[PDB]
Amino acid sequence: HWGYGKHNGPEHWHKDFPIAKGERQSPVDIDTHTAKYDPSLKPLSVSYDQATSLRILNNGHAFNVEFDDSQDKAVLKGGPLDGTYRLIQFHFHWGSLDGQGSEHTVDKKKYAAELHLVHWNTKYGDFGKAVQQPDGLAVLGIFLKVGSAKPGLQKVVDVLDSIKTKGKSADFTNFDPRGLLPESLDYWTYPGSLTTPPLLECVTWIVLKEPISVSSEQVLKFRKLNFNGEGEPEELMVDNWRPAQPLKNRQIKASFK
């Protein structure tokens, strides 16, 4: 099955998921000089005061912080979006070293990591139906750089030892994702895809300009996770990022001057 190795990594995904070579794949390089300011874009509205995290999961590709999405409790609206998108999970992508890890790039710059907060459009009723629609998901992407620790991340880091290997989960209640957000909500937006199989072209991407800072110690704990299951040969969970894909016939829009 797909993964991030030599034999099963991004460069192979098209054989099982031919949409990998589609017209609206993600991530992309954001060329800041050609992304045009769009005065018609709105401020993003991130409303996470009632978010209810439940659990953290090592799915063998990353770890997922999961939310109860059975009511409108944590929603993303505004920005480029029409309607209301409910938070279902967040996860990260990261590198073996601080010089790579992000999926999106900014003028070819790679960040150490990228956080994806995934939301589904309530007009389609459930996540599985939303991913079948071109406006089904809104993913908020946030870059991570290594410097100061992010106090709001530490709860996540400290639970990772309990989900070392693929298929492990653990209770993870009361975690507040507001602690992961940067000060500014300035963003770039473009139409794209999931960045893991099945690579469905269902996402409005909203990539924040301002990275968050995490400490080296924090990211080092991400790199102690395993892609393998309990008791199998250890292969560290690192470099679980898809590289930038062709922009094709897309425009990247900026919310800011």
Ligand SMILES: O=C(O)Cc1cccc([N+](=O)[O-])c1
């Ligand atoms: O399980 C998966 O890898 C598919 C999936 C599910 C939810 C979000 C995703 N994304 O690219 O942001 C991808």
Ligand SMILES: [Zn+2]
């Ligand atoms: Zn992702």
